[PDB]
Amino acid sequence: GEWTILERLLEAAVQQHSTMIGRILLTVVVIFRILIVAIVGETVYDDEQTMFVCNTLQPGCNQACYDRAFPISHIRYWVFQIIMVCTPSLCFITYSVHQSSRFYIIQVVFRNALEIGFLVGQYFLYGFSVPGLYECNRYPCIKEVECYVSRPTEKTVFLVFMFAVSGICVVLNLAELNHLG
Amino acid sequence: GEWTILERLLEAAVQQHSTMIGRILLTVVVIFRILIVAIVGETVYDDEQTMFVCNTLQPGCNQACYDRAFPISHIRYWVFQIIMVCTPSLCFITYSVHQSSRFYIIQVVFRNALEIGFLVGQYFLYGFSVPGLYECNRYPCIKEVECYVSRPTEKTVFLVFMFAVSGICVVLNLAELNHLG
Amino acid sequence: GEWTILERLLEAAVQQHSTMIGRILLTVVVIFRILIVAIVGETVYDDEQTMFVCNTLQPGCNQACYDRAFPISHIRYWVFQIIMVCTPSLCFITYSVHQSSRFYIIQVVFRNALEIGFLVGQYFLYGFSVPGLYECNRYPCIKEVECYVSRPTEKTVFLVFMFAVSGICVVLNLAELNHLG
Amino acid sequence: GEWTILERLLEAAVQQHSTMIGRILLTVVVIFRILIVAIVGETVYDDEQTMFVCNTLQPGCNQACYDRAFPISHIRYWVFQIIMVCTPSLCFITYSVHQSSRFYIIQVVFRNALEIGFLVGQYFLYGFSVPGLYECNRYPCIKEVECYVSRPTEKTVFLVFMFAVSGICVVLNLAELNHLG
Amino acid sequence: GEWTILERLLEAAVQQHSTMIGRILLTVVVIFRILIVAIVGETVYDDEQTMFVCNTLQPGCNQACYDRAFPISHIRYWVFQIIMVCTPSLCFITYSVHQSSRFYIIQVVFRNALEIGFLVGQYFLYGFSVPGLYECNRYPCIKEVECYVSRPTEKTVFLVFMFAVSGICVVLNLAELNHLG
Amino acid sequence: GEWTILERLLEAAVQQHSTMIGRILLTVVVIFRILIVAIVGETVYDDEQTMFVCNTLQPGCNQACYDRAFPISHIRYWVFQIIMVCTPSLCFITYSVHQSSRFYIIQVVFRNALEIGFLVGQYFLYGFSVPGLYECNRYPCIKEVECYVSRPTEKTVFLVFMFAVSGICVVLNLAELNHLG
Amino acid sequence: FSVPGLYECNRYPCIKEVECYVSRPTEKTVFLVFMFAVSGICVVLNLAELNHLGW
Extended beta strands in C3-94, E state = 53-54
Chain F residues whose beta carbon lies within 8 Å of the beta carbon of residue D76: 40, 43-44, 154
Phi and psi (nearest 5°) for C133? -130, 155
CA F28 to chain CA centroid, nearest Å: 14
Q: What is the DSSP letter of E31?
A: I
- Residue C93: other Cβ atoms inside 10 A: 17
- Chains touching chain B, criterion 3+ CB pairs below 8 Å: A, C, G
Bond prior to F71 in cis (omega within 30° of 0): no
The answer to whether A6 faces chain E, any CB pair under 8 Å, is no
Extended beta strands in chain A, E state = 53-54, 133-136, 145-148
E53, E151, E156: best to mutate for the F interface, most F CBs within 10 A: E151
Q: What residues are paired with F136 via a beta bridge? A: F145
Residues E26, E82 contacting (CB under 8 angstroms) = no
Residues E63, E54 contacting (CB under 8 angstroms) = no
The answer to whether B157 faces chain A, any CB pair under 8 Å, is yes
Q: What's chain B's length in residues?
A: 181
Give the Cα separation of A156 and D41 in Å (integer): 43
- Asked whether the beta carbons of residue B38 and residue A4 sit closer than 8 angstroms, the reply is no
Q: What's chain F's length in residues?
A: 181
Give the Cα separation of F151 and F50 in Å (integer): 12
Q: At a CB cut-off of 8 Å and minimum separation 6, what does A73 contact?
A: A45, A48, B154
Q: What's chain D's length in residues?
A: 181
- Structural method: cryo-EM
- Chains touching chain E, criterion 3+ CB pairs below 8 Å: A, F
Q: What residues are paired with A147 via a beta bridge? A: A54, A134
Give the Cα separation of B63 and D49 in Å (integer): 24
> Quick one: which of C59, E131, A122 has its CA closest to F139?
E131
Q: At a CB cut-off of 8 Å and minimum separation 6, what does F131 contact?
A: F149, F152
Q: What residues are paired with E145 via a beta bridge? A: E136
The answer to whether E94 faces chain F, any CB pair under 8 Å, is no
Residues A48, A150 contacting (CB under 8 angstroms) = yes
Residues B146, G16 contacting (CB under 8 angstroms) = yes
- Residue E59: other Cβ atoms inside 10 A: 15
Q: At a CB cut-off of 8 Å and minimum separation 6, what does G55 contact?
A: none
Chain E residues whose beta carbon lies within 8 Å of the beta carbon of residue F73: 154
Measure Cα distances from D19 to C12, D112, D167 in Å: 21, 15, 20
Give the Cα separation of A39 and E84 in Å (integer): 13
Burial class (CB in 10 A: 0-12, 13-18, 19+), C16: middle
- Asked whether the beta carbons of residue G17 and residue B145 sit closer than 8 angstroms, the reply is no
Give the Cα separation of C124 and C147 in Å (integer): 22
Give the Cα separation of C132 and B63 in Å (integer): 9
B49 closest CB neighbour out of C4, C47, C133:
C47
B133-153 in b/e burial notation, b at 16+ Cβ within 10 A?
ebebeeebbeeebbbbbbbbe
Residues D152, D153, D156, D162, CA torsion sign:
negative
> Quick one: which of C137, C134, C141, C138 has its CA closest to C57?
C141
Residue in E with minimal Cα distance to F46: E43
> Quick one: which of A141, A140, A138, B141 has its CA closest to G17?
B141
Residues C28, C168 contacting (CB under 8 angstroms) = yes
- Asked whether the beta carbons of residue B144 and residue G19 sit closer than 8 angstroms, the reply is no
The H or E element spanning position A67 is helix A61-69
> Quick one: which of C24, C30, C12 has its CA closest to C91?
C12
F2 closest CB neighbour out of E24, E38, E152:
E38
Give the Cα separation of D50 and D66 in Å (integer): 10
Give the Cα separation of E71 and E65 in Å (integer): 10
> Quick one: which of F4, F31, F167 has its CA closest to D91?
F31
The answer to whether B50 faces chain C, any CB pair under 8 Å, is yes
For every residue of B24-51, DSSP letters joined together read: HHHHHIIIIIIHHIIIIIHHHTSSTTTS
Residues in E 7-26 with any Cβ partner in A closer than 8 A? 9
E21-31 in b/e burial notation, b at 16+ Cβ within 10 A?
bbbbbbbebbb
The answer to whether A129 faces chain E, any CB pair under 8 Å, is no
Percentages (nearest 5) of helix, strand, coil residues in chain F: 65, 5, 30
3-state secondary structure of C162: helix
Bond prior to A152 in cis (omega within 30° of 0): no
Q: Do chains D and B touch (3 or more CB pairs under 8 A)?
A: no
F59 closest CB neighbour out of E36, E40, E148:
E148
Phi and psi (nearest 5°) for G24? 55, 55
| The 3-state secondary structure of E124-152, one letter per residue | HHCCCCCCCEEEECCCCCCCCEEEECCCC
Chain B residues whose beta carbon lies within 8 Å of the beta carbon of residue G18: 142
3-state secondary structure of A22: helix
Residue in C with minimal Cα distance to B141: C148
**Min Cα–Cα distance to chain G from B124, Å:** 29
Q: What's chain E's length in residues?
A: 181
Between strands D145-148 and D53-54, the pairing is antiparallel
Residues B53, B57, B62, B65, CA torsion sign:
negative
Rounded to 5°, angle at Cα A32 from A30 and A33 = 70
Q: Identify residues after which chain E is interrupted (C–N over 2.5 A).
A: 100
- Asked whether the beta carbons of residue F80 and residue E43 sit closer than 8 angstroms, the reply is no
* Radius of gyration of chain B measured on its C-alpha atoms: 20
Phi and psi (nearest 5°) for F103? -60, -40
Residues B125, B72 contacting (CB under 8 angstroms) = yes
Q: At a CB cut-off of 8 Å and minimum separation 6, what does E60 contact?
A: A53, A55, A146, A147, A148, E140
Phi and psi (nearest 5°) for E133? -130, 155
D14-23 in b/e burial notation, b at 16+ Cβ within 10 A?
eeeebeebbb
Q: At a CB cut-off of 8 Å and minimum separation 6, what does A175 contact?
A: A21
Distance spanning both ends of chain A, measured CA to CA? 39
